[PDB]
Design a protein around this ligand. Structure first.
Ligand SMILES: CCCCCCCCCCC(CCCCCCCCCC)(CO[C@H]1O[C@@H](CO)[C@H](O[C@@H]2O[C@@H](CO)[C@H](O)[C@@H](O)[C@@H]2O)[C@@H](O)[C@@H]1O)CO[C@H]1O[C@@H](CO)[C@H](O[C@@H]2O[C@@H](CO)[C@H](O)[C@@H](O)[C@@H]2O)[C@@H](O)[C@H]1O
Lengths: 96, 528, 75, 384, 336, 367, 134
């Protein structure tokens, strides 16, 4: 319900007067509404909005090569320890 | 794409309504023979390769260099498309030759030669395999067509006209009487409707299989056309032309059994009487083995509903990109011809958005059941040949988002904003009039091996066009996709964007249009 | 017992008492042209423009890991 | 793929399954004939015989009124004045309204003998506003489905086709069922319907052929209209478990979660609001597992009722699970629509068919559009 | 004689008086506690070689009999056994019992050891049966039951519905929606061998299959405890070996068929015979063109039907199944 | 990647059709004389050690995807004298039988089509000197890869070509550590009129005219161990099509393609050479090369390594090749495998080529 | 009879005639099938002392199926002629001597599907096959 959101409920850090640096990108405007998750994106939208106040703008926009880049290729480690003992055909222990 | 330029799939159309179900422009509401009074002659075909490879007697090299008869190669229409060696290198265009001054089949107009040719129509229709346009996301009708006012056999500039497309439920009653004609049920020993139904003989029995037998006598008695009359009793019905050898104008002629040029030989190739000769060695060779039936989607039922959308295309000498649904024009400067000469040519690409019909006829509200497709030419003064180098229904994987995106607007289905989504290719839009399509810097065409041949893959971008009234200050138009993508293992999301102004429109300025990506679990509650 | 039919640029699979899980359609170049993981013995509409290519390869994965291969001509 | 046989069965579904596995209904579907659009056009003596008939399927055949449902979404007929001739909640039957094929053109019927012919089918109606694809549909060589091409629930009155009708195909049925000692029929079978052909005369020059159509109940029309009641006959509470054919109990687990964005097995109220206070134990939403919210967990392992369920999906081979085909059926016809709407209702001012009256908890949890629209159309409601 | 029995009981010690689970219940609480019966199955398989070779008059028979009987009792859910109507009355809707029979008889019947040409007459007769009775209120014991009838537990197939209703151990609910069901299957596979001539080998075969399923709903009258069947119905399948070689070599094409002409002509003969069977010769058989049944006006709904079969008996037209099925069979088997 | 590849008709003529040459990096112009020496250098058929030989070669395509799609070769050679030889080879690329089926009562009769592409050639080789030989070959090529439909004509396209080959093989020469042998070879291939796939003179494709020049050396140790090192260079004799522009945007490209396609094959052979403002280095990008090493034990076991390099500007066919060969009594079996080193997917990857030759008749001594 | 069943319309009510003025039948079925097979109609299998073996056979079948739903008769008629010839030329010389085993297999299959109306002459040809092979 904060006034820092738009009439659509989107929060724009660039429009936040109490935030230094905005959204951290000088070229793009970033907004967020309701806890999305880019670890599982179910809905993808590309579109055109207007910024001309007293105008009706027309034109064509091409979108190309929507892609992910800069793979996080840090590795990982694993370690396994196995202790298998048998006691004179009476007992067997196997620890992992 | 779904290809629609198969000539054998098209059949003679019923008389169309033009603006509404209450419009008798072509006498579509008439319950008499007048229903067929405005039908002019139309031939639809694909020129047989025998005309180009082994020239038949009476066909010269001049007959094969006209821009209406010449063989079209893929490298002319698609200069950037790689074809593997030994595969199909020619484009098999769908040719529609329209004679507005000549009588169409089953036309009994007493005064047809004194009527205005531009008031006539010539039409064909077709069944659609997939009928749910919404589920399939059928976005537009795309066709590449040769400009008929440029080439060697160019039409006079005064011969301008219109091509109409109808999508939806279109009546299958070609000869409107409420009865389904099927000529495999005709014959002297068969029961007919006791009072003749105004066009000729209709079998009284219920049809079972749309097939002839192989008895030549039965074939002669059965393959008599959609009117059910063997050209000897047609004068009783078609009284204004009883003195002619073919009163109904439905006789079939094989294109190798005719004389003249290529166009003249296909003039009667679509006649329904005599087009199913039993023997393939007949001088009047068949061109089909199926009986002519007033049931086009082959569900045994003749539909009579007329609820469909109308789209229209102007055909004028000097059309340009940006109007008349034109998206691209490719000019061909020096076409080599079999007669040793050269000619100019112009290919025009039309993209008619299905979601924006020009008119509605009858009671159709959505695109969930689109069963029939019709196209008819009208308004032309003289003979006009239209060659579809491509004719497809194009469906997209990106769906237009309907419903408001900004709460300020609160009026989604209004404001008259034309919002279109299509694609721009390197293989089809390298000569696009405002901006030729090129790949973004660093982007290369993928290369594969078809059969010891290097094939460059197509490079495509998604094009969104905003026109008409235009976009309000904070309004937006978007397309969307249902995906399942994990981005957590990558650091950057990247995209190429391009902006251009529409032709014949006020120029778009910098930082007026904003390109946005909205991604998440939905577009209204949880998104970046 | 398996049949693939093409009437008008539409592919139609027919299996007698065998239910398919996946279908893949490849070109002669080896490029994957179509893939569906939710086969229901139904029809398939592949893009009609294939740049002069007619021969296609249909690979069908059934309930078990058995794979049925059929060469068809796209008409 | 799944269709209720009549609006009567569709409106009886929810109430009849309140105390499952007990079914509060005595309907026993005994006979069923199913006709579809014939595109194969193949005549064989082995595939159940060559039974090709002309069919006219009426949307409103056999329908009576319903107590809590207005007539405008039970039948498509423009005016119901004089249409019905049985009490309101009567079970579906040929005699329920004036479309009764047994009374065609007697004294006050809405149909003439012209209804029997395909050529004069439209003129076979005595009313004015009748459309060729809304009130009825016609087929000329409709093929009867064999018993291996469909199954049906004999108690709940719905059918499941082997092949789905994702296209313009027409579905028509005739069925006969019993309630105790009473027998009801809704369509025309081949044994009690009019003859296919009647011939008058002796030779082909003077012979007249009359091909007569069977009158059936329409379940799917030629043209899709989601606003017509026939659209509601298509079931949207059946889910096909992928790749599953012969699922059995002790080898099947199912849970319902809310993923916004993480999977959580309960539902929380919108900020600044709360769930309805003091609910019935069968309508709890606050701190309730979603299996109980959607009426899928009220029994224990032995399918005996338990206070708040046992935490596991109720596996009833005739009610909640279709064993032979690996399908799961909810106990309500619209679980994610009207059921959760009713569990979230706080007052009589909220109406399920009027989305403008939702109480802001129904505004985020009720997926009405997945039942009132097609799936592609429901794609536009992304947040539901 | 092989006998087998299986029994599954459920332990419900963790439940309260109402359907509320006990939170503080351990898995070892009453471990050696047999619960109430939930499912009980019995199977009996008896095989007999029938040593009829004792007498030297029937020493060529090699008969063999197999009898399999299956019985099942299934407890219904508490939603059925303790069903409460909106009126507040509590009804016991009972449990379910099922029965199955698998009679089988195989005889070799060596004709050895013009009729002497027969060598072997192999006869196979299979008879399956089944009975499902729902609404059966009583339970079963530890070792089984004989409560409906001892024969039923071993697949008698004799009727027990009326006896069960009289004994009072069917459900008293008057809107019971579960159907009493019966199924029967008969298969006969006679085979004979003939050697009329020294190098003439002849094999004869006869097959007959008949399957029948009956279903009905029921109630029990609150007084006198009498069983009321409701809407009983039957369906099934039939198949039998036949001979129609008499019409096998008659030409039959799209222009001529003698057998089909016989089919057309036999309809009136069959209809007349059926009319004599219905109207028993004491009155003139009413027909569609006579004075009492005149051809109606052209606008009458039955004008075409009356004109189509003018001389046929009133209830037996050309389209009657009872008329044209025997006509079809007689025409294509060559019978009169 | 591949900038301006050379477009030729019937490219299947350029595919190696035997496992022995495939295992040696697709080169045979200067290798030892064998039964497969017809695609590479017919002139060494006069240097054969056996009088007559037959051979069957199988090269499968898309092994994982489908069966019966393969390039087969059958070769026969007969050297009559000690100086001359005749040979005949047949290469056949096929997809196998394909059934054309509509549902239509699936018991209905169906039409089977076999789209294919074959070449049949015959060569005569004659020894001029004791160390040099020449050969002339004539080849007929037919292409029937199209399937007849409506508005599609599936008439086969045919052409003829000639081959001029030369092969030099020295005698055994003793050196300090081994007594090796020298070999050289050239082969001008596929010289013939353009093939018209659409049966129109205006739309015709150049035959894949090729030039192979190679040389090899045999290290012979212990009389039981041999190591043959061979190097081959190949140049297509077809003019390169115009590229981005060679000074109205598409008009210039259209005119350039018009002038390129109106070039005779005879004139195109010479136009392939030069046509660049630069020198030899700029033209070296149109030269493919291959280097092969074949170890031979007792003339009965063969182990082959090969490297084939095209310039990535055209074609992009760069790979290593492994090969093995065995000789039991008169039957020789060759197997070859390919490891691709190019960005573009090689159609012969993960593919085992098979070859099988029978040798019979008299035996000839080697000078 | 693939499926017969009892009729609820066959009851104790005074209503005895249906919409076609026919009396109600106690047992109703949709189809009846009469299937006949000569498999083979005649098979002559012999061999000459000259190693000439002939296996000839004629097979026949009829598949009458009458439908009461439309009262139509569907007749499927099939005939098959098979001839198998086997011979062995002995000691055929190309120094190289071998026997020549010659086998010939001729087949001729005719199949026809007819739909017959009972009240007028409307015999419809629905399907057919006229194949021969050697
Ligand atoms: C029509 C079309 C082709 C059919 C022609 C068949 C000819 C078969 C030739 C067999 C071959 C290559 C076989 C490998 C190629 C197969 C590849 C198949 C791949 C399929 C995917 C070696 O095969 C040898 O195998 C030996 C077994 O160890 C046998 O030795 C035999 O054992 C005893 C007999 O029992 C004998 O006493 C003994 O003397 C043999 O030594 C013989 O079978 C043969 O010599 C050829 O080598 C040699 O065969 C001889 C004739 O034998 C050929 O002489 C000529 O033949 C005809 C000329 O045409 C003329 O008539 C003939 O006058 C003339 O003398 C020569 O060519 C010669 O060079």
């Amino acid at each position: 319900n904060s006034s820092k959101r738009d009439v659509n409920g989107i929060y724009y850090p660039d429009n936040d007067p109490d935030l230094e640096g905005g959204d951290g990108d000088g070229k793009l405007t970033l907004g967020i509404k309701g806890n999305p998750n880019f670890g599982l994106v179910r809905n993808l939208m590309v579109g055109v909005k207007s910024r001309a106040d007293h105008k009706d703008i027309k034109g064509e926009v091409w979108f190309n090569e929507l892609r992910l880049a800069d793979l996080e290729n840090k590795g990982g480690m694993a370690a396994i320890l196995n202790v298998d003992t048998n006691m004179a055909d009476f007992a067997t222990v196997s620890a992992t | 794409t779904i290809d629609m330029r198969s000539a054998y799939a098209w059949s003679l159309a019923s008389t169309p309504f033009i603006t509404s179900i209450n419009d008798n422009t072509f006498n579509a509401n008439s319950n008499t023979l007048e229903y067929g009074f405005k039908r002019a002659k139309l031939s639809w075909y694909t020129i047989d390769p025998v005309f180009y490879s082994s020239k038949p007697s009476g066909i010269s090299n001049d007959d094969l260099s006209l821009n209406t008869t010449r063989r079209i190669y893929s490298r002319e229409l698609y200069p950037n498309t790689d074809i593997a060696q030994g595969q199909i290198q020619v484009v098999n265009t769908l040719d529609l030759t329209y004679y507005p001054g000549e009588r169409g089949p089953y036309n009994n107009n007493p005064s047809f030669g004194a009527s205005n040719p531009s008031a006539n129509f010539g039409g064909i229709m077709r069944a659609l395999n997939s009928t749910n346009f919404e589920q399939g996301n059928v976005e537009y009708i795309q066709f590449w067509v040769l400009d008929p006012y440029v080439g060697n056999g160019e039409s006079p500039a005064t011969n301008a006209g219109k091509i109409y497309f109808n999508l939806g439920e279109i009546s299958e009653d070609v000869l409107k009487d409420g009865r389904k004609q099927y000529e495999n049920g005709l014959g002297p020993d068969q029961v007919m409707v006791n009072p003749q139904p105004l066009w000729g003989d209709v079998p009284a029995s219920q049809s079972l299989i749309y097939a002839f037998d192989t008895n030549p006598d039965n074939r002669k008695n059965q393959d008599v056309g959609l009117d059910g009359l063997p050209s000897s009793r047609e004068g009783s019905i078609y009284t204004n032309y009883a003195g002619e050898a073919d009163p109904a104008g439905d006789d079939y002629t094989y294109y190798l059994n005719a004389d003249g040029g290529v166009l003249e030989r296909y003039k009667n190739y679509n006649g329904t009487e005599g087009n199913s000769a039993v023997s393939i060695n007949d001088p009047n060779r068949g061109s089909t083995t199926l009986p002519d039936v007033e049931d086009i989607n082959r569900d045994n039922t003749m539909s009579t509903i007329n609820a469909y959308y109308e789209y229209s295309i102007d055909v004028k000498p000097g059309m340009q990109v940006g109007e008349n649904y034109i998206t691209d024009i490719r000019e061909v400067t020096n076409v080599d011809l079999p007669n040793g000469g050269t000619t100019n040519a112009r290919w025009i690409q039309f993209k008619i958005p299905v979601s924006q019909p020009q008119n509605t006829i009858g009671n159709i509200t959505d695109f969930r059941s689109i069963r029939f497709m019709r196209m008819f030419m009208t308004g032309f003064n003289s003979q006009m040949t239209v060659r579809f180098g491509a004719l497809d229904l194009v469906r997209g994987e990106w769906r237009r988002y309907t419903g408001t995106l900004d709460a300020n607007d609160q009026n989604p289905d209004d404001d008259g904003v034309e919002f279109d989504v299509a694609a721009v290719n390197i293989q089809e839009n390298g000569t696009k009039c405002p901006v030729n399509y090129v790949m973004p810097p660093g982007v290369q065409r993928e290369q594969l091996y078809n059969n010891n041949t290097v094939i460059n893959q197509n490079e495509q971008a998604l094009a969104v066009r905003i026109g008409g009234a235009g976009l309000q200050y904070q309004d937006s138009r978007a397309v969307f996709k249902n995906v399942s993508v994990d981005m957590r293992q990558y650091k950057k999301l990247k995209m190429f964007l391009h902006a251009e102004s529409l032709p014949n429109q006020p120029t778009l300025e910098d930082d007026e249009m904003v390109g946005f990506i909205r991604f998440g679990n939905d577009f209204t509650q949880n998104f970046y | 017992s398996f049949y693939v039919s093409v009437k008008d640029k539409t592919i139609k699979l027919n299996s007698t008492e065998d239910v398919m899980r996946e279908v893949s359609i490849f070109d002669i170049s080896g490029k994957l042209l179509y893939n569906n993981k939710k086969v229901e013995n139904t029809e398939f509409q592949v893009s009609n423009f294939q740049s002069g290519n007619q021969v296609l390869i249909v690979k069908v994965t059934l309930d078990n890991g058995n794979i049925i291969t059929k060469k068809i001509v796209f008409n | 793929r799944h269709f209720f046989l009549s609006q009567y069965f569709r409106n009886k579904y929810d109430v009849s399954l309140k105390n499952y596995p007990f079914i509060d209904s005595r309907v026993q579907i005994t006979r069923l004939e199913v006709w579809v659009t014939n595109k194969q056009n193949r005549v064989t003596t082995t595939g159940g015989g060559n039974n090709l008939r002309n069919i006219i399927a009426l949307q409103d055949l056999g329908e009576a009124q319903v107590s809590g449902v207005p007539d405008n979404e039970v039948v498509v007929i423009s005016s119901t004045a004089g249409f019905f001739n049985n009490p309101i909640d009567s079970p579906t039957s040929n005699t329920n309204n004036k479309y009764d094929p047994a009374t065609i053109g007697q004294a006050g019927s809405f149909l003439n003998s012209n209804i029997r012919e395909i050529v004069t089918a439209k003129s076979g109606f005595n009313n004015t506003n009748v459309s060729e694809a809304t009130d009825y549909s016609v087929l000329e060589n409709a093929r009867k489905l064999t018993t291996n091409e469909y199954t049906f629930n004999p108690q709940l009155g719905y059918i499941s086709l082997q092949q789905r009708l994702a296209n313009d195909e027409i579905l028509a049925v005739a069925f006969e069922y019993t309630v105790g000692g009473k027998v009801y029929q809704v369509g025309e079978f081949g044994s009690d319907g009019v003859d296919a052909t009647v011939v008058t005369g002796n030779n082909s020059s003077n012979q007249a052929i009359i091909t007569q159509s069977l009158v059936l109940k329409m379940l799917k029309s030629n043209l899709t209209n989601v606003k017509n009641p026939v659209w509601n006959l298509m079931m949207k509470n059946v889910y096909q478990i992928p790749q599953a054919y012969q699922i059995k109990q002790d080898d099947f687990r199912l849970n319902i979660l809310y993923t916004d964005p993480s999977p959580i097995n309960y539902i929380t109220p919108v900020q600044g609001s709360s769930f309805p206070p003091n609910p019935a134990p069968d309508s709890k939403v606050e701190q309730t597992p979603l299996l109980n919210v959607f009426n899928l967990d009220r029994l224990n392992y032995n399918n005996d009722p338990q206070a708040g369920g046992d935490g596991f999906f109720d596996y009833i081979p005739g009610v909640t699970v279709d064993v032979q085909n690996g399908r799961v059926i909810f106990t309500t016809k619209e679980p994610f629509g009207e059921l959760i709407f009713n569990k979230l209702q706080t007052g009589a001012g909220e109406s399920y068919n009027d989305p403008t009256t939702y109480n802001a908890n129904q505004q985020k949890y009720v997926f009405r559009n997945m039942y009132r629209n097609t799936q592609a159309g429901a794609l536009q409601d992304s947040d539901k | 004689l092989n006998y087998s029995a299986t029994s599954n009981n459920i332990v419900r010690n963790f439940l309260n008086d109402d359907n509320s689970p006990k939170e503080d219940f351990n898995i070892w609480d009453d471990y050696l506690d047999i619960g109430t019966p939930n499912q009980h199955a019995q199977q009996l398989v008896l095989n007999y070689d029938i040593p009829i070779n004792k007498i030297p008059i029937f020493g060529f028979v090699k008969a063999s009999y197999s009898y399999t009987a299956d019985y099942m009792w299934q407890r219904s859910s508490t939603a059925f056994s303790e069903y409460e109507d909106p009126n507040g009355t509590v009804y016991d809707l009972g449990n379910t019992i099922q029965n199955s029979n698998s009679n089988t008889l195989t005889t070799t019947l060596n004709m050895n050891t013009v009729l002497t040409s027969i060598k072997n007459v192999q006869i196979n007769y299979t008879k399956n049966s089944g009975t499902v009775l729902p609404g059966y209120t009583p339970s079963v014991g530890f070792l089984g039951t004989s409560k409906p009838s001892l024969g039923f537990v071993f697949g008698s197939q004799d009727d027990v519905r009326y006896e069960a209703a009289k004994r009072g151990w069917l459900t008293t609910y008057q809107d019971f929606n579960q159907s009493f069901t019966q199924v029967s299957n008969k298969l006969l596979k006679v085979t004979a061998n003939i050697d009329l001539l020294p190098d003439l080998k002849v094999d004869l075969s006869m097959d007959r299959s008949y399957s029948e399923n009956t279903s009905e709903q029921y109630s029990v009258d609150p007084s006198t405890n009498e069983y009321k069947p409701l809407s009983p119905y039957t369906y099934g399948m039939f198949s039998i070996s036949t001979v129609m070689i008499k019409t096998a070599f008659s030409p039959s094409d799209e222009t001529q068929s003698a057998a089909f002409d016989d089919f057309r002509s036999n309809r009136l003969i069959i209809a007349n015979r059926l009319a004599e069977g219905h109207y028993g010769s004491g009155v003139a058989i009413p027909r569609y063109g006579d004075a009492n049944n005149p051809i109606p006006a052209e606008t009458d709904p039955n004008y075409a039907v009356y004109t189509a079969n003018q001389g046929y008996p009133i209830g037996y037209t050309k389209s009657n199944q009872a008329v044209l099925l025997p006509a079809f069979l007689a025409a294509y088997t060559g019978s009169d | 990647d591949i900038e301006r590849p050379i477009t030729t008709g019937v490219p299947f003529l350029l595919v190696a059709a035997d496992a022995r040459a495939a295992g040696l990096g697709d080169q045979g112009v200067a290798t030892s004389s064998d039964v497969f020496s017809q695609q590479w250098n017919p002139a060494k058929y006069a240097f054969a050690e056996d009088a007559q030989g037959l051979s069957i070669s199988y090269t499968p395509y898309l092994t994982d995807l489908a069966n019966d799609i393969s390039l087969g070769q059958v070769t026969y050679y007969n050297k009559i004298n000690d100086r001359s030889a005749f040979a005949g080879s047949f290469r056949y690329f096929g997809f196998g039988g394909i059934e054309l089926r509509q549902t239509g009562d699936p018991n209905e009769p169906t039409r089977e089509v076999n789209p294919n592409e074959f070449a049949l050639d015959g060569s005569y080789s004659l020894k001029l000197s004791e160390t040099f030989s020449m050969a002339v070959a004539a080849r007929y090529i037919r292409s029937n890869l199209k399937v007849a439909t409506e508005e599609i004509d599936a008439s086969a396209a045919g052409s003829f070509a000639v081959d001029v080959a030369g092969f030099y093989q020295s005698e055994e020469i003793a050196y300090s550590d081994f007594n090796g042998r020298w070999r050289a070879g050239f082969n001008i291939q596929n010289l013939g009129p353009k093939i018209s796939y659409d049966h129109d003179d205006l739309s015709a494709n150049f035959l894949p005219a090729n030039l192979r020049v190679g040389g090899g050396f045999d290290f012979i140790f212990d009389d039981y161990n041999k190591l043959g090192v061979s190097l081959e260079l190949t140049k297509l004799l077809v003019p390169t099509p115009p590229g981005p522009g060679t000074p109205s945007q598409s008009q210039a490209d259209e005119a350039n393609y018009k002038k390129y396609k109106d070039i005779g094959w005879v004139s195109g052979i010479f136009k392939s050479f030069g046509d660049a403002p630069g020198g030899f280095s700029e033209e070296l990008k149109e030269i493919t090369y291959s280097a092969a090493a074949e170890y031979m034990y007792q003339d009965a076991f063969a182990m082959r390594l090969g490297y084939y390099h095209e310039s990535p500007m055209k074609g992009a066919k760069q790979f290593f090749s492994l090969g093995a060969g065995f000789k039991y009594s008169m039957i020789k079996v060759d197997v070859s495998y390919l490891f691709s080193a190019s960005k573009v997917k090689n159609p012969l990857e993960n593919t085992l080529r098979f070859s099988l030759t029978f040798n019979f008749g008299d035996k000839y001594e080697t000078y | 009879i693939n499926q017969f069943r009892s009729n609820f319309d066959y009851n104790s009510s005074p209503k005895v005639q249906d919409v076609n003025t026919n009396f109600y039948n106690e047992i109703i079925m949709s189809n009846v099938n009469l299937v006949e097979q000569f498999s083979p109609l005649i098979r002559m299998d012999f061999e000459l002392k000259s190693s000439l073996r002939v296996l000839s056979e004629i097979k026949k079948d009829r598949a009458l199926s009458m439908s009461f739903d439309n009262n139509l008769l569907t007749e499927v008629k099939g005939m098959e002629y098979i001839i198998g010839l086997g011979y062995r030329f002995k000691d055929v010389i190309f120094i190289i001597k071998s026997d020549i085993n010659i086998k010939a297999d001729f087949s001729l299959r005719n199949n026809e599907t007819l739909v017959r109306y009972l009240d007028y002459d409307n015999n419809q040809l629905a399907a057919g096959q006229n194949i021969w092979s050697l």
